[PDB]
């Protein structure tokens, strides 16, 4: 029986600019799961300290490559659906 659709892994290849961003915080591969992309995005925001010091869910990125990739000047980590849309524009899914 096929793995339930909801359970199937989401395998992705970051487009060149997102891949450059992930490699800047240690990623060394071309292909990832969505979980791994999310891990590296967290590492990148943490390392560059793009988050608001007091309201740490809020990320400022108008003067960052992340803003050009996501197409927003800032966002909240709590915006789960929007963050997915922003990430997917920078990924090719691997069948
Ligand atoms: C470092 C870390 O915690 N990453 C992370 C968190 C939740 C999940 N869950 C599932 C079920 O994918 C996977 C990875």
UniProtKB/Swiss-Prot annotation:
<comment type="subunit">
    <text>Interacts with p53/TP53, TP73/p73, RBL5 and RP11. Binds specifically to RNA. Can interact with RB1, E1A-associated protein EP300 and the E2F1 transcription factor. Forms a ternary complex with p53/TP53 and WWOX. Interacts with CDKN2AIP, RFWD3, USP7, PYHIN1, and RBBP6. Interacts with ARRB1 and ARRB2. Interacts with PSMA3. Found in a trimeric complex with MDM2, MDM4 and USP2. Interacts with USP2 (via N-terminus and C-terminus). Interacts with MDM4. Part of a complex with MDM2, DAXX, RASSF1 and USP7. Part of a complex with DAXX, MDM2 and USP7. Interacts directly with DAXX and USP7.</text>
</comment>
<feature type="domain" description="SWIB/MDM2">
    <location>
        <begin position="10"/>
        <end position="93"/>
    </location>
</feature>
<feature type="region of interest" description="Sufficient to promote the mitochondrial pathway of apoptosis">
    <location>
        <begin position="1"/>
        <end position="85"/>
    </location>
</feature>
<comment type="function">
    <text>E3 ubiquitin-protein ligase that mediates ubiquitination of p53/TP53, leading to its degradation by the proteasome. Inhibits p53/TP53- and p73/TP73-mediated cell cycle arrest and apoptosis by binding its transcriptional activation domain. Also acts as a ubiquitin ligase E3 toward itself and ARRB1. Permits the nuclear export of p53/TP53. Promotes proteasome-dependent ubiquitin-independent degradation of retinoblastoma RB1 protein. Inhibits DAXX-mediated apoptosis by inducing its ubiquitination and degradation. Component of the TRIM28/KAP1-MDM2-p53/TP53 complex involved in stabilizing p53/TP53.</text>
</comment>
<feature type="region of interest" description="Necessary for interaction with USP2">
    <location>
        <begin position="1"/>
        <end position="94"/>
    </location>
</feature>
<comment type="subunit">
    <text>(Microbial infection) Interacts with herpes virus 8 protein v-IRF4.</text>
</comment>
<comment type="similarity">
    <text>Belongs to the MDM2/MDM4 family.</text>
</comment>
<protein>
    <recommendedName>
        <fullName>E3 ubiquitin-protein ligase Mdm2</fullName>
    </recommendedName>
</protein>
């Amino acid at each position: 029986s096929q793995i339930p659709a909801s359970e199937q892994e989401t395998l992705v290849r970051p487009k060149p600019l997102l891949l450059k961003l992930l490699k800047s915080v240690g990623a060394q591969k071309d292909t990832y799961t969505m979980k791994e992309v999310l891990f590296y995005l967290g590492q990148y925001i943490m390392t560059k300290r793009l988050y608001d010091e007091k309201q740490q869910h809020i990320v400022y990125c108008s003067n960052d490559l992340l803003g050009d990739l996501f197409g927003v000047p800032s966002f909240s980590v709590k915006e789960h659906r929007k963050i997915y849309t922003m990430i997917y524009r920078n990924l090719v899914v691997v069948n």
